[PDB]
Every structure is written in structure tokens, then in C-alpha cells.
Amino acid sequence: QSWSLSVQTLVFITSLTFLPAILLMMTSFTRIIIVFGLLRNALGTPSAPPNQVLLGLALFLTFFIMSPVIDKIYVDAYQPFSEQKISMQEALDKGAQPLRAFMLRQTREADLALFARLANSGPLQGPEAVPMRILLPAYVTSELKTAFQIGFTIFIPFLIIDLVIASVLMALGMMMVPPATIALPFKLMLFVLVDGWQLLMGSLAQSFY
Amino acid sequence: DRLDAALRFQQEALNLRAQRQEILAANIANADTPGYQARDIDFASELKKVMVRGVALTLTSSHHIPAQAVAVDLLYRVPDQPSLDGNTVDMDRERTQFADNSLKYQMGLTVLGSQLKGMMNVLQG
Amino acid sequence: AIQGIEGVISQLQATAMAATVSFAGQLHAALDRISDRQAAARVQAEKFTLGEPGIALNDVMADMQKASVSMQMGIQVRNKLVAAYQEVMSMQV
Amino acid sequence: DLNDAQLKFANDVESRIQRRIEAILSPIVGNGNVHAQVTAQLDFANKEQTEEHYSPNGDASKATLRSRQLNISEQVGAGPRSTQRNETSNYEVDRTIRHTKMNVGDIERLSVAVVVNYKTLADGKPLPLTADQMKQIEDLTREAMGFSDKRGDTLNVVNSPFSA
Amino acid sequence: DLNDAQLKFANDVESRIQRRIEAILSPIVGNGNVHAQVTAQLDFANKEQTEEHYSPNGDASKATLRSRQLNISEQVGAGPRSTQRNETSNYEVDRTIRHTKMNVGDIERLSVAVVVNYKTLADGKPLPLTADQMKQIEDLTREAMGFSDKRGDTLNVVNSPFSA
Amino acid sequence: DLNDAQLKFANDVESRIQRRIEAILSPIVGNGNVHAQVTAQLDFANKEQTEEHYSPNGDASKATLRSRQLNISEQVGAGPRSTQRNETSNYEVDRTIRHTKMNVGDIERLSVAVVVNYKTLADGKPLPLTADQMKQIEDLTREAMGFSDKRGDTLNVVNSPFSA
Amino acid sequence: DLNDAQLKFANDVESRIQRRIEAILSPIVGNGNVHAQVTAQLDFANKEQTEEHYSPNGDASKATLRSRQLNISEQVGAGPRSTQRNETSNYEVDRTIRHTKMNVGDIERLSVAVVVNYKTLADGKPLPLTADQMKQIEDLTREAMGFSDKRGDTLNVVNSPFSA
Amino acid sequence: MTPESVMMMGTEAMKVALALAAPLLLVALITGLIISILQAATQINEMTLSFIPKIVAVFIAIIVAGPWMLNLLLDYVRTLFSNLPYIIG
């Protein structure tokens, strides 16, 4: 029943190409980088930390978040593979289950129902019987919605600062003063004193739980 | 299953040529045993009948012996001359047929190899 | 087990009543066919090496060549599919 | 929960069998001169069954064929005779699939106890009934209870004077 | 739940059979001079059946053919005779598929108990009925109940004077 | 929790069997002149069973076939005879799958103890009952309790004068 | 925690068995002239069992077959005889899977101690009971307790005058 | 993230913002009104004498209350970021 060695090598190397797709659509990465893409907008500096710094920070945070899932996959599936007690097909079947559970717990029921209806799937008895073709796009949709929620909530204190600074500038008759340049250093103050970066990463990690 | 169907005729003809070559070699080996009748196979008829057309035990368990399940009409060559030992092997005809069979086996190999070479050349890019 | 025969009675009772294509399934079927052909050729060659009587060399070589052709076809199809996927995923939306 | 519903189902079935017996036993024996009680062993086990039947085709007269190859050879030289018959036959067979889901709550075994009174004439002497009348009561009760031998039904009707 | 609906279905069927019997037994025996009760063993088991039948084609006269190859060889030299007949035949057969879904609630076995009264003349003597009249009542009840032998129906009609 | 529900289920079953016995034992023996108590060994074990049955096909008359190859060779030269028969047969067999889920709460073994009183006449002497009456009581109790031998039911009815 | 619940379950079972015994022992021996106590060895061990049974097919009459190849060769030249029979048979067997989950809280072994009083007549002499009455009490207690020999039940009833 | 929750969030944020602006805005308004009253009582025509004391009072208000507003706003931001994981729906 086991695949031949040539077929196993072909399948492994072929599946190695889907690494960015798996990372974006199956792991936490999508929620993280998107929030960063909004946070640099809230601070008033589109330049912000460089793009690569944010991407790598998101990658490290994603690895830390998926450490339990990676450990469970390593224990349940890949360990018998290395110790010759399982095939490649059975390993692929078994290792996806913890990742499927992780995806399902962050998946909104409405999106899952939408993609079921759109695939004309039969009556799914319970979460355990949800096909991956239905769980993947629904998870991506819920991920986007959650990331937008977090970003909009993040946008709040900087809006407070901008409004207060603009009101102070206008109450003094200084109407011709653009408040963005004045309020940018105070936004940096707010992010520094409250330890914005550490607080935000802790909040993201707790949100995934 | 189209690769099997496309190469089926030549592979089966090659196997039949090998079987007939074995039979001809057995004829040559027994050239001096008395009471032996030279035998052969009609190539064309057998080939068409193979192209037109056991029961292994059911291993439902994962721990039992696979066991075993375990067909050419042998036609007698018409003798040329009578011999007192009753040996109907005429060595001239058998040698001519041996050379012919070896040649046609090589031709079948060449044709099958050309088909495989063309099929593999199509995929090479 | 008990679960299995319940399933089989269910199968018969749907058969009595009677009387979505997925690309992943097709890819799995093609890979299984390639692996099965390769395994059959390998098993026949192993048996022939061990001196089994009812196996001929020409059949062994022809089966090995057919398995090689099938695996080459699989490799080429994979290459074309990967090229298409990498072209589609490189868009600027 | 479900057990109470099953028990109430059994009680209703028993009560209705009792009433059916009493209904026919009343006009002849008289009101109150007959008492009957019914107990029912019921079937609350969900069963599902699929049956497959193949008609035999061993006889050449009822055998249905799709393809048949009959190679016959006779090289007569009994002498050096050589007979050879290679026969291959492909058949099509009759097939019947039956799928059955037995009802939950069926009756397995019904046993019924019936007691009748004596006959008090105008004088008041409790004269017992006769054998023919007892047989008639037994037959009527068997009819009312739906008596069957496959189920294993038992019926007992006795005659005795009722107490005050 | 469903069991109560099935029981009410059985009660209605039994009551209607009882009324049909009473309707014909009334004009001749008289109002109240006849009492009958019906019990019904019903079928609440969902069954589905598919039947396949093949017409036999073993006789060459009714055999339908699509292709036939008959190679015949006779090399006469009985002497050194050599007969060889290779026959291959492909047939087309009649086919009948029947799919049946039995109705839920059918009657399996019906047993009916009927009791009639005596005949009180102008004097008042309860004169019993005759054998011919009893046979007529039995036939009428058999007709009303839909008596059949495949089902296993049982009928018992007895004559006895009704109580006051 | 669940154990208390099972115990109450057993108590209700025992009480209803007791009442059914008392109901028939009352009219003849008299109110209070009979006391019975029932204990029930019940079945609270969930069992699931799947049964597969194959009809035997060893007899050629009931054997259903799909394909049959019969190669027969007889090279007569007993002399230098050479018989060879290669027979290959593929069969289709009858198949019956039954899936059964036994009900939870069924009765395994029922034992019932019944005690009757003596008979005090107008004088007041406690005259004991007779053997025929005792046999009638035993039969009635067996009918009421649903007595069966497969279960292993035991019944004991004794006669003794009741205390004041 | 759970142990206390199990102990209360045992206490309730023992009390109900005691009350059932007392109920039948009261009318004949008298109120207070009988005392009984019950101890119960219970089963609080969760057991799960799966049973597989195969019907034997060693006899050719009950053997069900799917495919059978019988190659027979007899080259008679006992002389230079040469018999060869190659037989290959594939069977289909009956199969029964039973899955059982035993109930938690079942009774393993029940032992019951019953003591009865003496009989004080109108004079007041404590006259002991008789052997027949003692046997009747033993039978009644066995019926009430659900006495069985597979469990290993023990019963002891002794007669002695009660203290003041 | 129901509409009622989002608005309860907006209302709380606007409370914090207005509680942050009021100490400064009220002082600026009082200073401007007093200066304009003095101008009306003295009959001067120049709309710039109300700016310099305004900015002065704004600076003194900042110097006096900066720790208070800074602490309050930092605590609000900390509370919001701590509750952030638990408002998503």
C-alpha cells in the first residue's frame, strides 16, 4: 500500500513549493502581518520599521504561536515516519488533524456555512467531518475579518491623540497649522511609554488562544 | 491503462517468440533421443487467440500463507523421412526455424524499443 | 468489526434503493497508479532474480520500461502544474 | 425516560387486549361475572436486516447465458482416440435484495389469565358452568387475544365462584 | 409517540371491521342480538425490495444472439478421422427489474370473535338457532372480515343466550 | 444518578407485576386474602450485534454460478489412458446481514413470592384451601407474571393463615 | 466522593431487598415477629467486551464457497498409474460481532440473614415453629431475595424467641 | 463585535478624549473670554491680545497637569490593549 520511494520523493519536493501558501492560509501569519500593515499606518509613519523587519517578526511570532501544533504533528505523525511505522499517505492523513483543529477553532461558523452551501456539500455530522476544501477558504475569510477588527481597534488611541491635538490647535486660533506633523511625535510617545510593541504582540498571541 | 494496451501486441508477440524459441531449443537438445516427436506452435493462431482472450486464496487475514493458484496447443511437426529410432526431428527444418525465430525475436525487440524510445522522447523537454 | 458490518448492511440497503469531482482525489489516484505499476515491476524483477520459473526476462524489462515511462509522464505533468501555479500566484491582483 | 414510555406503551396494549376480551365475554357470562388481565412481552430492540437471494442455475434448462465458448475435438485414430472438450460459460442470475427495518414495540409473547364466575340461579345456588361453555370461552378468548403458536402464547381460563 | 399513532391506526381498522360485520349481521339476527370484536396483527416494518429476473436461454429456439462464430473442421483420412468444432456465441437476454416498497400498516393476520343471541319467541322461550343459520352467519362474517388463508385468518362464531 | 433511575425502573416493573397478579387473585380468594411481592433481575447492559449468514452452496442443485470453465481431455491409447479434467467455478451466494441493538432495561429472570390466606367459614374455622384451588392459583400467577423457562423464572405459592 | 455514592447505592439496594422480604414474611409470621438484614456485594468495575464468532465450515455440506478450482489428472499406463488432484477453495463464513458494555452497579453475591420469633399462644408459652413452616419461610425468602446459584447466594433463616 | 459593543467602545474613547481636552480647552476659553471682556470694557480694536495669554495659560496648564493626563491616557491604552484579545467575535 505504501508509495514507492520515487513517488514519495516527488510528492515531498512538490509539496515543498506550497510553503508560502500553507503559511499564509493555514497558520497565524495572515492575521499578524496584516495588523502590522495597519499599525504602521496608525502611527502616522508608513515607512515605520522596514518591511522585512516586520515580516521576520511576524514569522517568529507565527512559529511561537504554532509551536504546540508543530509539536503535536511531530509527535503523532512525523515520528513514526522517521522511525518507520507509518507510510507517507497515512502520515499526511494523520498530521493534518491538529492543524485542522487549530484552523477550526478560529473559523467563524457563518463563513464555514457559506462555503458549504457554495460547494453543495451534504449534511456534515460534526466539526470532525468538515472537508479541508471547505475549511481553508472559510478560515482565511474569518482570519481577514479578525485582523480588520484588531486593526480598527488599534486605530483608536492615535485617533484620540489626533483629535485632541487638532482641537487644541484650533481653539487657539492656530487654524493654519497642520496637526499631523505635531501629533506624530506624540503618537511615538504613546507607543513608547505604554510599551506598544510588546503589548501588541502579547495581545495577538493571547487572541489566538 | 493505455500504455499497457498500446504496447500489448508487441510484448505478447515477443513473449510468444521466446516460448517458441525454448520449444525449438528443446527440439534441438532431444535430436538424438529415440521415440521423440518434434513439436512446435502455430505462431499466428496462438498470438490472435492470446490477444482476443488462477484462483489465488483469499488472504483476508494479515498473517497467512499467500499459497498458489497455478496453455498452447502443441502441434506435432510432420516428419520428412522415416527413421528406425522413431525420431521425427529433421535438423534442417529445425535449424531454419531456429534462425528465423531468433531473427524475429530481435525484430520484435527492435520495434518495441522504438515504440518506447518514441514515447520517452515525446515526454523529454 | 461491528461498525464494519453495520456499514456493509447500509451499503446493501442503498444498493437495493438504487436498483463532486475533486482534483486532489485525481492526483492521489494518479500517484497510486504510478506507485502500483512501479511496485509490480519491482516485485516481478525481484522474483525473477530469485530464480522463479514462470517469469521471463523480456517481460521484466518491458514492465520496467513501462513503469519508467509512466513515472516520467507523472514528472512532466507535475512540472507543468507547478509552472502554472507559480505563474498564477505571481500576479499583482 | 424512554423506559417509562415503553412501559406505558406496554400498559396500554395490555389494557386494550383486556378490554377486547371483556367486551365479548360480557354479553354471555354477564357484567362483572368475568375478569381478565393481560401481560405482554414486547420488542424494543432496533433491528435492521438486508437479505440477498440468488436463484439456482445448476440446471441447463433454467440457466441464463451471456457468452458460451464450446471447443470440441475428436481425433480418432477404442484405439488411439483423443477427445477434448473445453467449455466456458458466463451466466446471468436472478437477484432479489430485501431491506427490512423491524418495528419497535412489536409483541413477542402474550399470556392472558381469565377468571369467570359461577351461575347463581333464582334460588341462589352457585351452579358451576359446563365443559361446552368453558370451551366456548376459551375459543373466544383465543380469538380476542390474537392467539398464535409461533409467538408462544399461553392462555388459562378457570371457573371459580367470586368472593363477596 | 409513533407507537401511539400505530395503536390508534390498529384500533380504527378493528372498529371498522367490527362495524362492517355488525352491519350485515343486524338485519337478520336483529339489533343487539349480535356482538363482534376484531383484533388485527399489523405490519409497521418498512421493507424495500428489488427483484431481477432473467428469461432462460438454454434452448436454441428461444435464444437471442448477437454474434456467433462456428469453426468446423473434418479431416477424414473410422480410420484417422479428425473432427474439430469451435463454437462461440454471444447472447442477449430478457431482463425485468421490479422495485417494490411495501406499504406501512398492512394487515398480517386477522382473527375475529362473534357471538350471537338466542331467539325468544312470543312466548319468551330462548330457542337456539339452527345449523344452516349458523353456517350463513359464518359465511357472512368471513365475507365481511375479508377472510383469507394466506394471511392465516381465524374466525369463531358461537351461539349463546345473552345475559340480562 | 443513573443507578437510581434504574432502581426506580425496577421498582415500577415489580409493582406492576404485583398489581397484575393481585388483580386476578382478588375476585376468587378475596380482598386482602392474597399478598404477592415481585423481584426482577433486569438488563442494563448496552449490547450491539451484527450477524452475517451465508447459505450453503456445496450441493450442485442449489449452487448459483456466474462463470464456469470445464476443460475435459481423454486420450485413450485400461491401457495408456489419460484423463484430465480442469474445472473452475465462480459462485454467487445468498447473504443476510442483521444488525440488532438490544433494549436497555429488559427482564432477565423474574421470581415471584405469593402467599394466600385460609378460609374462615361462618363459624370462623380457618379451613385450608384444596389442591385444585392451589393449582389454579399457581396457573393464574404463572400467567400474570409472564412465566417462562428460557428466562429461568421461579414461582412459589404457599397457603397459610394470616396473622391478626 | 464516588465511593460514598456507591455505598449509598448498596445501602438502598439492601434496604429494598430487606423490605421485600419483610412484606411477604409479615402476613403469616406477624408484624415484628420477623427481622431480616441484607448485605450486597456489588460490581462497580467498568467492563467492555467485544465478541467475534465464526461458524465452522469444515463439513462440505455447510461450507459456503465463492470460487473453486479442481484440477484432476489420471494417467493410467497398479502399474504406472499417476493420479494428481489440485484443489483450491475460497470460502465465505458466517460472522457475529457482539459488543457489550456491562452495567455499573450490578449484584455479584447476595447473602441474607433472617430471624423469626416464636409463637406465644393465649396462655403465653413461646411455642417454636414447625419444620414445614420453616421450609415455607426459607422458600419465600429465596423468592424475595432473588436467590440464584450462579451468583453464589447464601441464605440462613433461624428460629429463636425474641428478647423483651 | 456587535454594533452595541463597538459604540460602547467609541463612547468610552470619546469620554477619555473629552476628559483630556477639557482641562486645556476650558482654560483657553476662560482666558479668551476674559481678555475679550477687558477689551470691550477698554474699547480696543485688535484681535491678537487674546492669543498670547491664551498660549501662556495653555503652557501653564500643560506644566501643571501633564503627569495626570499622561497617566490617565496610558492607563486607558493599557486597558484597551489588555482587553483587545477578548473583544473579537
Tab-separated table of C-alpha atoms in Angstrom, chain B residues 31-125:
chain	number	residue	atom	x	y	z
B	31	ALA	CA	17.673	-34.508	-31.526
B	32	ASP	CA	19.031	-37.989	-30.716
B	33	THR	CA	16.565	-39.369	-28.171
B	34	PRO	CA	14.606	-42.231	-29.777
B	35	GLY	CA	10.832	-42.121	-29.886
B	36	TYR	CA	10.783	-38.331	-29.664
B	37	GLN	CA	8.372	-36.379	-31.858
B	38	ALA	CA	9.290	-32.851	-32.893
B	39	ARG	CA	6.770	-30.280	-31.663
B	40	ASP	CA	6.080	-26.637	-32.466
B	41	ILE	CA	3.478	-23.876	-32.080
B	42	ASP	CA	1.495	-22.134	-34.799
B	43	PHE	CA	2.611	-18.583	-34.043
B	44	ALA	CA	-0.183	-16.648	-35.753
B	45	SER	CA	-3.108	-18.614	-34.311
B	46	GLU	CA	-1.706	-18.561	-30.778
B	47	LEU	CA	-0.993	-14.828	-30.987
B	48	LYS	CA	-4.523	-13.960	-32.122
B	49	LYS	CA	-6.041	-16.269	-29.502
B	50	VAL	CA	-3.936	-14.652	-26.764
B	51	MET	CA	-4.859	-11.130	-27.887
B	52	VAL	CA	-8.581	-11.949	-28.116
B	53	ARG	CA	-8.638	-13.632	-24.692
B	54	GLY	CA	-5.612	-18.896	-11.492
B	55	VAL	CA	-7.776	-18.528	-8.339
B	56	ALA	CA	-5.358	-17.386	-5.570
B	57	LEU	CA	-6.531	-17.978	-1.981
B	58	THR	CA	-8.226	-15.006	-0.221
B	59	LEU	CA	-5.706	-13.526	2.245
B	60	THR	CA	-8.390	-11.722	4.313
B	61	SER	CA	-6.027	-12.144	7.324
B	62	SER	CA	-2.659	-10.315	7.556
B	63	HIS	CA	-0.851	-13.468	8.784
B	64	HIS	CA	-1.388	-16.453	6.447
B	65	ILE	CA	0.462	-18.106	3.528
B	66	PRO	CA	-0.450	-16.467	0.165
B	67	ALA	CA	-0.403	-20.035	-1.287
B	68	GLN	CA	-0.648	-20.510	-5.104
B	69	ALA	CA	-3.344	-20.542	-7.852
B	70	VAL	CA	-1.298	-22.410	-10.546
B	71	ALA	CA	-1.672	-23.170	-22.463
B	72	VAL	CA	-0.505	-23.519	-26.071
B	73	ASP	CA	-1.744	-26.416	-28.194
B	74	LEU	CA	1.461	-28.268	-29.067
B	75	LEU	CA	1.272	-29.300	-32.719
B	76	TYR	CA	3.383	-32.181	-33.980
B	77	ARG	CA	5.761	-31.421	-36.823
B	78	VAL	CA	5.085	-33.644	-39.829
B	79	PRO	CA	8.125	-35.902	-40.362
B	80	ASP	CA	10.178	-35.587	-43.539
B	81	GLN	CA	11.702	-39.076	-43.652
B	82	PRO	CA	11.270	-42.228	-41.550
B	83	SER	CA	13.941	-43.228	-39.057
B	84	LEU	CA	14.286	-46.522	-37.222
B	85	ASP	CA	14.596	-44.921	-33.771
B	86	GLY	CA	11.285	-43.119	-34.354
B	87	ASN	CA	12.826	-39.649	-34.093
B	88	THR	CA	10.877	-37.173	-36.225
B	89	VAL	CA	13.330	-34.290	-35.647
B	90	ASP	CA	14.572	-33.164	-39.067
B	91	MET	CA	17.542	-30.985	-38.167
B	92	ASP	CA	17.495	-28.865	-41.340
B	93	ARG	CA	13.962	-27.589	-40.722
B	94	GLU	CA	14.648	-27.115	-37.010
B	95	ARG	CA	17.787	-25.066	-37.709
B	96	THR	CA	15.993	-22.931	-40.301
B	97	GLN	CA	13.160	-22.315	-37.831
B	98	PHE	CA	15.650	-21.559	-35.041
B	99	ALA	CA	17.379	-18.896	-37.131
B	100	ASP	CA	14.017	-17.475	-38.232
B	101	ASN	CA	12.692	-17.358	-34.663
B	102	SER	CA	15.833	-15.697	-33.302
B	103	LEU	CA	15.698	-13.115	-36.094
B	104	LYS	CA	12.027	-12.328	-35.491
B	105	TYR	CA	12.626	-12.103	-31.736
B	106	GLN	CA	15.313	-9.491	-32.415
B	107	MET	CA	12.965	-7.638	-34.746
B	108	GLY	CA	10.238	-7.609	-32.099
B	109	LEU	CA	12.774	-6.224	-29.642
B	110	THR	CA	13.720	-3.504	-32.143
B	111	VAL	CA	10.095	-2.499	-32.766
B	112	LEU	CA	9.166	-2.450	-29.070
B	113	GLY	CA	12.314	-0.490	-28.247
B	114	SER	CA	11.495	2.032	-30.964
B	115	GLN	CA	7.975	2.484	-29.579
B	116	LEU	CA	9.317	3.023	-26.057
B	117	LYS	CA	12.027	5.359	-27.381
B	118	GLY	CA	9.470	7.491	-29.206
B	119	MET	CA	7.167	7.616	-26.191
B	120	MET	CA	10.049	8.673	-23.920
B	121	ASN	CA	11.307	11.212	-26.476
B	122	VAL	CA	7.876	12.843	-26.574
B	123	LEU	CA	7.952	13.431	-22.793
B	124	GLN	CA	11.533	14.765	-22.791
B	125	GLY	CA	11.523	18.559	-22.585
